[PDB]
């Protein structure tokens, strides 16, 4: 089979500058002088969107920012300049040989300005306590970069076990990220202690954003 | 263009499942069609292709002999018969219009239908209202312990789209957990009703938890 190897698994570029994504094929994707390589743009919750067909042909409706070039085995997708709504995962695909194969994809993220997280701690729901469980949620909304740190503190202690995290995809408008840290415990252990803390260490501030509550 | 695929469901390994795709707005009979899926790892994989008349069918070796792409040009519907299902078949199946005269790649995709191939049983989710230290106000919703995916979490029936961050479900040993934060103004809550809503199709669950202050 023909394997498609895409350069930059992920690429971070500033708004207003160009991006270059490569796609190398293990075998020629050419036939009859035409290159059967295709480029797609996939945003979260939506199916791939055709940007360029046959290496260099711009699909109608697609802004001129996008352009394609290459032949035989080496291909390139160029976004110039990169706009805020361009954040997505780009895939290359060959249709020269059966079976048709796709590249692993290249996630494009915008180098937006630094922004501190908006931490919000949420104690266990009364309804959840009836089930014998106790999850303390902590939302860290709108921040950049993606790399952040959450350290849970139960009665001053740094609880390491039972933390289920989840990051959202970079927002298409403000170019920020959001994170949810969840410390899951049993109701018995939850009632054993009193103070629950959710600390957020980020590059925007030396002092971590502490958010806690006294159980009552 | 306008491809609505259906039939996605949780099936046991080695089982069978058939997918459908309603094509409307164009002359379906003249177009070559295809099925393309996307694994949980976000990997795009071509599944099958069938000619306008249905005489020519193409399938990758990992799918050939188990999957069968066919179509009904009378009612304009594309089909995908899946048999001897494997764990690797777990993916989002997109109905794609392949071509007419030229190879223009995959120009029109459907919104997809999720097919989950697992031995785990269907478990209904537990929706929990997340009042802040209820006392701009941020609120939250906890959908814990459910299988399989997905769930449709919405705020105020969709009328509340501002400041909503619905986080990706994380798998905690055969059971997913999804969260969502809605950030509104102090004059909007608890003054107005903000209802933490959820819906799980696999279990026929439809829970509406109202965010009540603490």
């Amino acid at each position: 089979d023909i394997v498609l190897t895409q350069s930059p698994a992920s690429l971070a570029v500033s708004l207003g500058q160009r991006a270059t994504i490569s796609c190398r094929a293990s075998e020629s994707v050419d036939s009859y002088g035409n290159s059967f390589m295709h480029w797609y743009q996939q945003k979260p919750g939506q199916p791939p969107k055709l940007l360029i067909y046959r290496a260099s042909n711009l699909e109608s409706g697609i802004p001129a920012r996008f352009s394609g070039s290459g032949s035989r085995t080496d291909f390139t997708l160029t976004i110039n300049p990169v706009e805020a709504d361009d954040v997505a995962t780009y895939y290359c695909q060959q249709s020269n040989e059966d079976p048709l194969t796709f590249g692993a994809g290249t996630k494009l993220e915008l180098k937006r300005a630094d922004a501190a997280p908006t931490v919000s701690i949420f104690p266990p729901s009364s309804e959840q306590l009836t089930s014998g469980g106790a999850s303390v949620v902590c939302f860290l909304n709108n921040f950049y970069p993606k790399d952040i740190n959450v350290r849970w503190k139960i009665d001053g202690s740094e609880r390491q076990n039972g933390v289920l995290n989840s990051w959202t995809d970079q927002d298409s408008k403000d170019s920020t990220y959001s994170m949810s840290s969840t410390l899951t415990l049993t109701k018995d252990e939850y009632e054993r202690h009193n103070s629950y803390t959710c600390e957020a260490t980020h590059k925007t501030s030396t002092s971590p954003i502490v958010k806690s509550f006294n159980r009552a | 263009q306008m491809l609505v695929e259906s039939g996605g469901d949780l099936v046991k390994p080695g089982g069978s499942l058939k997918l459908s795709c309603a094509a409307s707005g164009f002359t379906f009979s003249s177009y070559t069609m295809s099925w393309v899926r996307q694994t949980p790892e976000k990997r795009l994989e071509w599944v099958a292709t069938i000619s306008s008349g249905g005489a020519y069918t193409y399938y990758p070796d990992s799918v050939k002999g188990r999957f069968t792409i066919s179509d009904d040009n009378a009612e304009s519907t594309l089909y995908l018969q899946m048999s001897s299902l494997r764990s690797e078949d777990t993916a989002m199946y997109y109905c794609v219009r392949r071509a007419f005269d030229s190879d223009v790649g995959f120009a029109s995709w459907g919104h997809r239908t999720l097919v989950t191939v697992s031995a785990a049983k269907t478990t209904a989710p537990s929706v929990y209202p997340l009042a802040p230290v209820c006392g701009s106000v941020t609120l939250g919703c906890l959908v814990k312990g459910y299988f399989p995916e997905p769930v449709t979490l919405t705020w105020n029936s969709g009328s509340l789209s501002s400041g909503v961050h619905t986080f990706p479900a994380v798998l905690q040993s055969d059971l997913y957990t999804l969260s969502s934060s809605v950030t509104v103004t102090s004059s909007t809550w608890p003054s107005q009703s903000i209802t933490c809503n959820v819906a799980h199709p696999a279990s026929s669950t439809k829970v509406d938890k109202k965010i009540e202050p603490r």
């Binding site: 036939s31 059967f36 059966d98 | 070559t32 000619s51 392949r98 190879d103």
Partner: peptide, 13 residues
């Protein structure tokens, strides 16, 4: 030709 003879559109005549 805008279609390949080794692909999934080889029937496309």
């Amino acid at each position: 030709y805008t279609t390949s003879t080794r692909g999934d559109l080889a029937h496309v005549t």
